[PDB]
XYZ file of N, CA, C and O in Angstrom:
296
model
N 141.201 108.744 75.242
C 141.230 109.764 76.319
C 140.832 109.186 77.659
O 141.564 108.385 78.238
N 139.670 109.583 78.149
C 139.190 109.113 79.434
C 138.008 108.167 79.252
O 137.055 108.476 78.533
N 138.071 107.010 79.897
C 136.972 106.056 79.847
C 136.224 106.062 81.180
O 135.329 105.249 81.417
N 136.599 107.003 82.039
C 135.967 107.164 83.343
C 134.479 107.453 83.183
O 134.090 108.543 82.761
N 133.658 106.466 83.497
C 132.221 106.617 83.398
C 131.639 106.998 84.754
O 131.292 106.134 85.562
N 131.580 108.293 85.015
C 131.065 108.791 86.277
C 129.544 108.872 86.264
O 128.896 108.674 87.292
N 128.967 109.148 85.102
C 127.515 109.140 84.971
C 127.071 108.079 83.975
O 127.129 108.285 82.763
N 126.637 106.914 84.479
C 126.055 105.861 83.662
C 124.531 105.948 83.618
O 123.881 105.324 82.780
N 123.969 106.732 84.529
C 122.529 106.874 84.639
C 122.108 108.269 84.209
O 122.233 109.226 84.974
N 121.645 108.386 82.975
C 121.171 109.662 82.462
C 119.814 109.992 83.071
O 119.621 111.063 83.646
N 118.887 109.047 82.960
C 117.551 109.193 83.525
C 116.940 107.808 83.734
O 117.189 106.897 82.941
N 116.167 107.647 84.803
C 115.577 106.348 85.141
C 114.279 106.127 84.368
O 113.323 106.886 84.509
N 114.249 105.080 83.553
C 113.122 104.853 82.655
C 112.149 103.808 83.195
O 111.005 104.129 83.513
N 112.593 102.560 83.290
C 111.680 101.484 83.634
C 112.137 100.668 84.825
O 112.608 101.221 85.820
N 111.998 99.347 84.717
C 112.346 98.435 85.803
C 113.841 98.475 86.106
O 114.631 99.018 85.334
N 114.219 97.889 87.230
C 115.596 97.920 87.705
C 115.868 96.719 88.603
O 114.975 96.247 89.305
N 117.090 96.221 88.558
C 117.501 95.106 89.399
C 118.671 95.515 90.283
O 119.388 96.467 89.976
N 118.859 94.797 91.377
C 120.028 94.990 92.214
C 121.134 94.062 91.734
O 121.142 92.868 92.051
N 122.045 94.614 90.952
C 123.066 93.822 90.293
C 124.438 94.159 90.845
O 124.820 95.325 90.914
N 125.172 93.136 91.247
C 126.530 93.316 91.724
C 127.460 92.357 90.997
O 127.173 91.168 90.900
N 128.560 92.866 90.472
C 129.537 92.008 89.821
C 130.748 91.835 90.727
O 130.845 92.483 91.770
N 131.665 90.965 90.329
C 132.798 90.595 91.178
C 133.713 91.792 91.471
O 134.406 91.817 92.488
N 133.692 92.786 90.591
C 134.520 93.981 90.754
C 133.710 95.163 91.286
O 134.195 96.297 91.309
N 132.488 94.901 91.723
C 131.608 95.964 92.193
C 131.301 95.776 93.675
O 131.875 94.899 94.324
N 130.417 96.608 94.211
C 130.030 96.520 95.611
C 128.507 96.499 95.753
O 127.957 95.646 96.449
N 127.830 97.445 95.104
C 126.371 97.440 95.033
C 125.898 98.411 93.954
O 126.285 99.580 93.947
N 125.058 97.929 93.051
C 124.602 98.741 91.935
C 123.156 98.432 91.557
O 122.694 97.294 91.660
N 122.445 99.467 91.139
C 121.110 99.319 90.591
C 121.192 99.333 89.076
O 121.593 100.329 88.478
N 120.828 98.225 88.463
C 120.956 98.077 87.027
C 119.585 98.131 86.370
O 118.731 97.278 86.622
N 119.351 99.153 85.538
C 118.072 99.340 84.851
C 117.775 98.224 83.858
O 118.626 97.862 83.038
N 116.563 97.690 83.925
C 116.134 96.661 82.995
C 115.814 97.297 81.646
O 114.658 97.552 81.301
N 116.875 97.595 80.922
C 116.801 98.257 79.633
C 118.116 98.024 78.909
O 118.162 97.909 77.687
N 119.184 97.951 79.692
C 120.484 97.550 79.186
C 120.671 96.056 79.418
O 119.936 95.457 80.205
N 121.634 95.452 78.740
C 121.848 94.014 78.860
C 122.872 93.711 79.948
O 123.823 94.468 80.150
N 122.647 92.620 80.665
C 123.550 92.194 81.723
C 124.663 91.323 81.139
O 124.389 90.328 80.464
N 125.933 91.696 81.374
C 127.087 91.016 80.774
C 127.457 89.693 81.472
O 126.749 88.694 81.330
N 128.548 89.683 82.237
C 129.048 88.455 82.843
C 129.758 88.756 84.159
O 130.156 89.895 84.404
N 129.903 87.735 85.003
C 130.572 87.913 86.280
C 129.714 88.668 87.271
O 130.224 89.364 88.151
N 128.405 88.518 87.128
C 127.449 89.275 87.917
C 126.716 88.394 88.925
O 126.876 87.171 88.947
N 125.910 89.041 89.751
C 125.129 88.381 90.780
C 123.888 89.214 91.086
O 123.989 90.420 91.329
N 122.723 88.584 91.046
C 121.481 89.273 91.361
C 121.197 89.188 92.857
O 121.060 88.099 93.414
N 121.132 90.342 93.507
C 120.878 90.398 94.939
C 119.388 90.609 95.211
O 118.868 90.205 96.254
N 118.703 91.229 94.256
C 117.281 91.517 94.391
C 116.695 91.886 93.030
O 117.369 92.512 92.212
N 115.448 91.492 92.790
C 114.816 91.764 91.509
C 114.134 93.116 91.461
O 114.371 93.972 92.317
N 113.277 93.304 90.463
C 112.604 94.581 90.267
C 111.503 94.804 91.299
O 110.405 94.261 91.212
N 111.853 95.567 92.313
C 110.911 96.036 93.315
C 111.164 97.517 93.551
O 112.204 98.011 93.133
N 110.227 98.202 94.218
C 110.264 99.666 94.401
C 111.688 100.239 94.466
O 112.526 99.776 95.246
N 111.936 101.257 93.640
C 113.253 101.886 93.518
C 113.773 102.347 94.875
O 114.922 102.079 95.230
N 112.912 103.018 95.631
C 113.273 103.529 96.946
C 113.677 102.394 97.879
O 114.566 102.551 98.714
N 113.033 101.244 97.708
C 113.283 100.086 98.553
C 114.600 99.414 98.188
O 115.341 98.962 99.062
N 114.884 99.340 96.892
C 116.128 98.744 96.419
C 117.324 99.614 96.800
O 118.342 99.106 97.270
N 117.192 100.926 96.605
C 118.232 101.865 97.014
C 118.432 101.802 98.517
O 119.561 101.723 98.995
N 117.331 101.814 99.256
C 117.397 101.707 100.707
C 118.155 100.445 101.105
O 119.137 100.517 101.829
N 117.722 99.305 100.571
C 118.324 98.009 100.887
C 119.837 98.002 100.629
O 120.616 97.627 101.507
N 120.251 98.431 99.439
C 121.666 98.392 99.080
C 122.487 99.342 99.950
O 123.617 99.027 100.335
N 121.916 100.496 100.264
C 122.587 101.472 101.106
C 122.625 100.998 102.558
O 123.597 101.251 103.274
N 121.576 100.296 102.986
C 121.559 99.674 104.307
C 122.724 98.701 104.433
O 123.474 98.752 105.400
N 122.876 97.834 103.434
C 123.921 96.811 103.449
C 125.302 97.437 103.331
O 126.276 96.923 103.875
N 125.382 98.556 102.625
C 126.641 99.265 102.468
C 127.063 99.888 103.798
O 128.253 100.044 104.080
N 126.075 100.228 104.612
C 126.315 100.810 105.922
C 126.506 99.713 106.970
O 127.460 99.728 107.747
N 125.589 98.761 106.966
C 125.612 97.651 107.902
C 125.686 96.335 107.137
O 124.746 95.959 106.434
N 126.810 95.642 107.271
C 127.060 94.430 106.502
C 126.271 93.253 107.065
O 126.818 92.403 107.772
N 124.977 93.241 106.777
C 124.092 92.150 107.162
C 122.994 91.982 106.116
O 121.975 92.671 106.156
N 123.216 91.090 105.139
C 122.245 90.823 104.075
C 120.999 90.122 104.604
O 121.082 89.263 105.484
N 119.845 90.474 104.060
C 118.588 89.924 104.545
C 118.306 88.563 103.922
O 117.500 88.447 102.999
N 119.007 87.552 104.429
C 118.824 86.164 104.014
C 119.221 85.956 102.550
O 118.466 86.275 101.629
N 120.415 85.420 102.344
C 120.885 85.103 101.004
C 120.532 83.660 100.662
O 120.592 83.242 99.505
N 120.167 82.905 101.689
C 119.711 81.536 101.516
C 118.189 81.506 101.518
O 117.554 82.342 102.166
N 117.622 80.554 100.778
C 116.171 80.401 100.660
C 115.546 81.655 100.049
O 114.908 82.460 100.732
N 115.778 81.830 98.760
C 115.229 82.957 98.023
C 114.657 82.491 96.689
O 113.845 83.177 96.069
N 115.101 81.319 96.256
C 114.605 80.701 95.035
C 114.537 79.191 95.228
O 115.384 78.606 95.907
N 113.531 78.562 94.649
C 113.309 77.141 94.854
C 113.919 76.325 93.722
O 113.366 76.251 92.620
N 115.071 75.727 93.990
C 115.718 74.853 93.025
C 115.051 73.481 93.038
O 115.517 72.539 93.677
N 113.931 73.392 92.348
C 113.121 72.189 92.343
C 112.325 72.115 91.053
O 111.272 72.773 90.960
């Protein structure tokens, strides 16, 4: 029938990450389900309001807050 998943978020339980995949734009992924493939972490588990704010900010104004120098490859 229909595979249209309009509601993937029943209720917010625990931690959450800012996860975006190649076919997505911006999503908050709850740390309770498993992360598949073709994804990208934009931000880790920090205040829900802050993550939503950040992603919505970027969705409105296309200026990411430093994508370089966020993890130390050393």
